[PDB]
Short mmCIF file of C-alpha atoms in Angstrom, two decimals:
data_model
loop_
_atom_site.label_atom_id
_atom_site.label_comp_id
_atom_site.label_asym_id
_atom_site.label_seq_id
_atom_site.Cartn_x
_atom_site.Cartn_y
_atom_site.Cartn_z
CA UNK A 1 0.00 0.00 0.00
CA UNK A 2 2.64 2.54 1.14
CA UNK A 3 6.39 1.99 1.57
CA UNK A 4 7.99 4.21 4.20
CA UNK A 5 11.74 4.87 4.20
CA UNK A 6 13.81 6.87 6.68
CA UNK A 7 16.70 8.60 4.93
CA UNK A 8 19.36 10.66 6.64
CA UNK A 9 21.06 13.73 5.26
CA UNK A 10 24.57 12.70 4.24
CA UNK A 11 23.67 9.03 4.42
CA UNK A 12 26.73 7.64 2.60
CA UNK A 13 28.96 10.38 4.04
CA UNK A 14 28.48 9.65 7.75
CA UNK A 15 30.17 7.02 9.92
CA UNK A 16 28.57 3.58 10.26
CA UNK A 17 29.35 1.14 13.13
CA UNK A 18 29.01 -2.56 13.77
CA UNK A 19 26.59 -3.62 16.47
CA UNK A 20 25.42 -7.02 17.61
CA UNK A 21 21.65 -7.65 17.60
CA UNK A 22 19.60 -9.90 19.95
CA UNK A 23 20.38 -13.20 18.20
CA UNK A 24 24.12 -12.54 18.66
CA UNK A 25 24.73 -11.57 15.00
CA UNK A 26 26.54 -8.44 13.76
CA UNK A 27 25.34 -5.75 11.36
CA UNK A 28 26.15 -2.10 10.61
CA UNK A 29 24.26 1.05 11.58
CA UNK A 30 24.60 4.80 11.36
CA UNK A 31 26.78 6.01 14.20
CA UNK A 32 25.98 9.11 16.29
CA UNK A 33 27.38 10.82 19.35
CA UNK A 34 25.71 12.71 22.17
CA UNK A 35 24.41 16.12 20.99
CA UNK A 36 24.69 15.58 17.23
CA UNK A 37 21.80 16.76 15.10
CA UNK A 38 19.66 14.01 13.57
CA UNK A 39 18.18 15.05 10.20
CA UNK A 40 16.83 13.51 7.03
CA UNK A 41 13.47 12.88 5.44
CA UNK A 42 10.63 10.39 5.53
CA UNK A 43 9.95 9.07 2.01
CA UNK A 44 6.56 7.66 1.15
CA UNK A 45 6.08 5.48 -1.93
CA UNK A 46 2.58 4.76 -3.18
CA UNK A 47 2.24 1.09 -4.16
CA UNK A 48 -0.20 2.04 -6.92
CA UNK A 49 -0.01 5.69 -8.07
CA UNK A 50 -3.64 4.92 -8.85
CA UNK A 51 -4.95 4.93 -5.27
CA UNK A 52 -5.35 7.45 -2.45
CA UNK A 53 -4.12 6.99 1.13
CA UNK A 54 -6.21 8.24 4.05
CA UNK A 55 -4.35 8.92 7.29
CA UNK A 56 -4.83 10.74 10.59
CA UNK A 57 -1.35 12.23 10.52
CA UNK A 58 2.26 11.43 9.77
CA UNK A 59 5.06 11.90 12.29
CA UNK A 60 8.72 11.20 12.96
CA UNK A 61 10.00 10.40 16.49
CA UNK A 62 13.54 10.13 17.83
CA UNK A 63 13.56 7.63 20.69
CA UNK A 64 16.16 6.29 23.12
CA UNK A 65 14.91 3.52 25.38
CA UNK A 66 15.86 0.66 27.71
CA UNK A 67 14.12 -2.67 27.21
CA UNK A 68 14.23 -5.09 30.21
CA UNK A 69 13.76 -8.70 28.99
CA UNK A 70 12.06 -9.71 32.30
CA UNK A 71 9.42 -7.05 31.65
CA UNK A 72 9.75 -7.22 27.93
CA UNK A 73 7.07 -5.13 26.30
CA UNK A 74 7.24 -2.31 28.87
CA UNK A 75 9.81 0.10 27.36
CA UNK A 76 11.54 2.77 29.42
CA UNK A 77 12.17 5.77 27.18
CA UNK A 78 14.68 8.31 28.41
CA UNK A 79 14.76 10.50 25.32
CA UNK A 80 11.67 11.12 23.16
CA UNK A 81 11.43 13.73 20.43
CA UNK A 82 8.31 14.10 18.30
CA UNK A 83 7.93 16.02 15.02
CA UNK A 84 4.55 15.93 13.27
CA UNK A 85 5.11 16.02 9.51
CA UNK A 86 1.51 16.12 8.19
CA UNK A 87 -2.00 16.82 9.51
CA UNK A 88 -4.73 14.21 9.08
CA UNK A 89 -5.33 14.23 5.35
CA UNK A 90 -4.82 12.22 2.19
CA UNK A 91 -1.77 11.05 0.30
CA UNK A 92 -2.45 11.08 -3.43
CA UNK A 93 1.11 10.77 -4.65
CA UNK A 94 4.61 9.65 -3.68
CA UNK A 95 6.44 12.30 -1.65
CA UNK A 96 8.85 12.95 1.20
CA UNK A 97 8.94 15.15 4.29
CA UNK A 98 12.01 16.77 5.79
CA UNK A 99 12.81 16.61 9.51
CA UNK A 100 15.57 17.84 11.73
CA UNK A 101 16.25 17.12 15.38
CA UNK A 102 18.95 19.49 16.63
CA UNK A 103 20.53 19.03 20.08
CA UNK A 104 19.68 15.37 20.44
CA UNK A 105 20.71 14.12 23.84
CA UNK A 106 22.14 10.63 23.83
CA UNK A 107 23.81 10.17 27.23
CA UNK A 108 24.31 6.40 26.97
CA UNK A 109 26.06 4.05 24.61
CA UNK A 110 23.98 1.49 22.69
CA UNK A 111 23.94 -1.96 24.28
CA UNK A 112 22.54 -5.38 23.46
CA UNK A 113 22.73 -7.62 26.53
CA UNK A 114 21.48 -10.90 27.94
CA UNK A 115 18.59 -9.48 30.02
CA UNK A 116 18.45 -5.90 28.71
CA UNK A 117 18.87 -3.71 25.62
CA UNK A 118 19.52 0.00 25.22
CA UNK A 119 18.68 1.29 21.77
CA UNK A 120 18.07 4.49 19.88
CA UNK A 121 15.94 4.63 16.75
CA UNK A 122 13.91 6.81 14.42
CA UNK A 123 10.25 5.87 14.09
CA UNK A 124 8.03 7.11 11.23
CA UNK A 125 4.32 6.58 11.77
CA UNK A 126 1.43 6.98 9.37
CA UNK A 127 -1.58 7.03 11.69
CA UNK A 128 -4.59 5.20 10.25
CA UNK A 129 -8.14 4.17 10.96
CA UNK A 130 -7.46 0.51 11.68
CA UNK A 131 -3.69 -0.04 11.78
CA UNK A 132 -0.88 2.48 11.48
CA UNK A 133 2.06 2.08 9.13
CA UNK A 134 5.14 2.12 11.36
CA UNK A 135 8.71 2.17 10.16
CA UNK A 136 11.73 2.07 12.49
CA UNK A 137 15.41 2.45 11.74
CA UNK A 138 17.95 1.85 14.51
CA UNK A 139 20.95 4.09 14.99
CA UNK A 140 23.94 3.26 17.22
CA UNK A 141 25.42 5.62 19.79
CA UNK A 142 28.95 5.47 21.19
CA UNK A 143 30.28 7.43 24.15
CA UNK A 144 33.91 8.57 24.09
CA UNK A 145 36.08 9.05 27.18
CA UNK A 146 39.61 10.28 27.88
CA UNK A 147 42.01 9.36 30.68
CA UNK A 148 45.65 10.16 31.72
CA UNK A 149 50.92 3.52 38.02
CA UNK A 150 50.31 -0.10 39.08
CA UNK A 151 47.55 -2.19 40.70
CA UNK A 152 47.86 -5.39 42.73
CA UNK A 153 45.50 -8.11 43.85
CA UNK A 154 46.30 -11.34 45.64
CA UNK A 155 44.82 -14.80 46.04
CA UNK A 156 45.52 -17.43 48.69
CA UNK A 157 46.94 -17.72 52.22
CA UNK A 158 50.08 -16.03 53.54
CA UNK A 159 53.08 -18.37 53.83
CA UNK A 160 51.07 -21.34 52.53
CA UNK A 161 49.89 -21.07 48.94
CA UNK A 162 50.00 -17.40 47.99
CA UNK A 163 49.97 -15.63 44.60
CA UNK A 164 49.98 -11.99 43.58
CA UNK A 165 48.84 -10.53 40.28
CA UNK A 166 50.02 -7.03 39.44
CA UNK A 167 48.89 -5.08 36.38
CA UNK A 168 49.44 -1.60 34.97
CA UNK A 169 46.12 0.31 35.11
CA UNK A 170 42.69 0.26 36.71
CA UNK A 171 41.22 1.57 33.40
CA UNK A 172 41.73 0.36 29.82
CA UNK A 173 40.44 1.44 26.42
CA UNK A 174 38.80 -1.21 24.24
CA UNK A 175 41.96 -1.86 22.19
CA UNK A 176 44.39 -1.58 25.08
CA UNK A 177 46.74 -4.21 26.45
CA UNK A 178 46.59 -5.42 30.01
CA UNK A 179 50.20 -5.80 31.12
CA UNK A 180 51.08 -7.53 34.36
CA UNK A 181 52.96 -10.14 36.31
CA UNK A 182 52.13 -13.16 38.45
CA UNK A 183 54.44 -13.22 41.52
CA UNK A 184 54.63 -16.51 43.40
CA UNK A 185 54.79 -15.25 46.98
CA UNK A 186 54.76 -18.75 48.51
CA UNK A 187 54.36 -22.23 47.07
CA UNK A 188 54.16 -24.46 50.15
CA UNK A 189 51.30 -26.42 48.57
CA UNK A 190 51.40 -27.65 44.96
CA UNK A 191 49.58 -25.66 42.25
CA UNK A 192 47.07 -27.82 40.40
CA UNK A 193 45.73 -24.94 38.25
CA UNK A 194 45.92 -21.17 37.75
CA UNK A 195 44.24 -18.67 35.45
CA UNK A 196 43.47 -14.99 34.99
CA UNK A 197 39.98 -14.26 33.60
CA UNK A 198 38.37 -11.18 32.15
CA UNK A 199 34.76 -11.41 33.29
CA UNK A 200 31.84 -9.31 32.10
CA UNK A 201 29.07 -8.95 34.71
CA UNK A 202 25.68 -7.70 33.57
CA UNK A 203 23.38 -6.58 36.38
CA UNK A 204 19.74 -5.84 35.44
CA UNK A 205 17.15 -4.19 37.70
CA UNK A 206 13.52 -4.99 36.82
CA UNK A 207 10.78 -4.32 39.35
CA UNK A 208 11.88 -5.42 42.88
CA UNK A 209 14.23 -7.92 41.26
CA UNK A 210 17.82 -7.97 40.07
CA UNK A 211 19.14 -10.39 37.42
CA UNK A 212 22.80 -11.30 36.98
CA UNK A 213 24.66 -12.66 34.00
CA UNK A 214 28.34 -13.48 33.85
CA UNK A 215 30.28 -13.99 30.71
CA UNK A 216 33.91 -15.07 30.73
CA UNK A 217 35.41 -12.93 27.99
CA UNK A 218 38.97 -14.25 28.25
CA UNK A 219 40.89 -16.84 30.24
CA UNK A 220 44.70 -16.89 30.25
CA UNK A 221 45.80 -20.21 31.78
CA UNK A 222 49.19 -20.35 33.54
CA UNK A 223 51.30 -23.30 32.42
CA UNK A 224 52.90 -26.23 34.29
CA UNK A 225 53.67 -27.18 37.90
CA UNK A 226 57.10 -25.53 37.95
CA UNK A 227 56.43 -22.64 40.33
CA UNK A 228 58.65 -21.89 43.31
CA UNK A 229 58.86 -18.83 45.56
CA UNK A 230 60.34 -15.73 43.90
CA UNK A 231 59.47 -16.91 40.39
CA UNK A 232 57.26 -14.57 38.36
CA UNK A 233 55.32 -14.80 35.07
CA UNK A 234 54.57 -12.05 32.53
CA UNK A 235 51.01 -11.43 31.38
CA UNK A 236 49.88 -9.61 28.28
CA UNK A 237 46.18 -9.51 27.51
CA UNK A 238 45.19 -7.91 24.20
CA UNK A 239 41.68 -6.47 24.53
CA UNK A 240 41.24 -5.67 20.82
CA UNK A 241 40.51 -9.20 19.66
CA UNK A 242 37.62 -9.53 22.11
CA UNK A 243 34.09 -8.24 21.85
CA UNK A 244 34.10 -5.54 24.49
CA UNK A 245 31.79 -2.64 25.35
CA UNK A 246 32.69 0.22 27.63
CA UNK A 247 31.86 -0.15 31.29
CA UNK A 248 28.28 0.98 31.87
CA UNK A 249 27.45 1.97 35.40
CA UNK A 250 23.86 2.14 36.63
CA UNK A 251 22.38 3.38 33.36
CA UNK A 252 19.25 5.24 34.42
CA UNK A 253 19.28 2.92 37.45
CA UNK A 254 18.25 0.01 35.30
CA UNK A 255 21.40 -1.96 34.50
CA UNK A 256 25.18 -2.13 34.79
CA UNK A 257 27.80 -3.70 32.61
CA UNK A 258 31.05 -4.21 34.52
CA UNK A 259 34.37 -5.91 33.82
CA UNK A 260 36.67 -7.74 36.23
CA UNK A 261 40.09 -9.34 36.36
CA UNK A 262 39.39 -12.61 38.11
CA UNK A 263 42.27 -14.64 39.55
CA UNK A 264 41.65 -18.39 39.88
CA UNK A 265 43.95 -20.70 41.91
CA UNK A 266 43.30 -24.38 42.49
CA UNK A 267 45.66 -26.21 44.84
CA UNK A 268 46.80 -29.83 44.70
CA UNK A 269 44.02 -30.52 47.21
CA UNK A 270 41.37 -29.27 44.76
CA UNK A 271 40.77 -26.11 46.80
CA UNK A 272 39.55 -23.02 44.91
CA UNK A 273 40.89 -19.55 45.74
CA UNK A 274 39.25 -16.63 43.90
CA UNK A 275 39.92 -12.91 43.87
CA UNK A 276 38.51 -10.32 41.47
CA UNK A 277 38.99 -6.63 40.88
CA UNK A 278 37.14 -4.22 38.60
CA UNK A 279 38.77 -2.62 35.60
CA UNK A 280 36.91 0.24 33.94
CA UNK A 281 36.72 -0.18 30.19
CA UNK A 282 36.30 2.97 28.10
CA UNK A 283 35.99 3.89 24.41
CA UNK A 284 38.76 6.01 22.91
CA UNK A 285 38.00 8.52 20.15
CA UNK A 286 40.00 7.88 16.95
#
């Protein structure tokens, strides 16, 4: 009947970006940053030039919302901009309408999680008697940060089985390298297994309930049973190869995405020793 398209000014001139959708598959989208104007036009195409189209209005909305999978259809919009493009009337021809949203606040980076999604999109609606024609196009938003030592954590018991992991920063950009050292402070008991993990923890608030999802992004296993006091081991973790998002902290009080270095030690007696410490991941502007 009618084919609605959303078309941005400078479509093929503006940056795209890859973003994973709910299935886990990648795809590209127009990339925007906080503030940036969002402008283009809504293009209507009449299926048969020989036929009128009665509507109760045509509008374009810019929306940023958080969708909680445990309350799925109940969207939480945090930015909503509405521009009416036509009064209730009749379409008797193919045509387009211009729109411009200036000063578009986008305080949060796009995110597609396990129990939650944060997305921005344009929505064109042709209001109708029975059912509206709705067309959405997603855009992706990134947030850039900038930042300027050494950090230590330890696992185990003093003077028994005791390890120390030291690394260079408490914050890393998404293509950074985590550079550190395992120091064997004391190897009284034999080491059955050791590893350093990067763990992503997704915390989702929905109603009176909190949901928790952990994803082990990387595990660097330490080799052999050769350790003796004073011996150390170098660690270099390249973040770039991994799928990583910036840290997201209490986004509109609905969810957090946090990253942790997690030190795992299993002794010859099958005993687990865990320690973890947060690293803040941030996105660096090219």
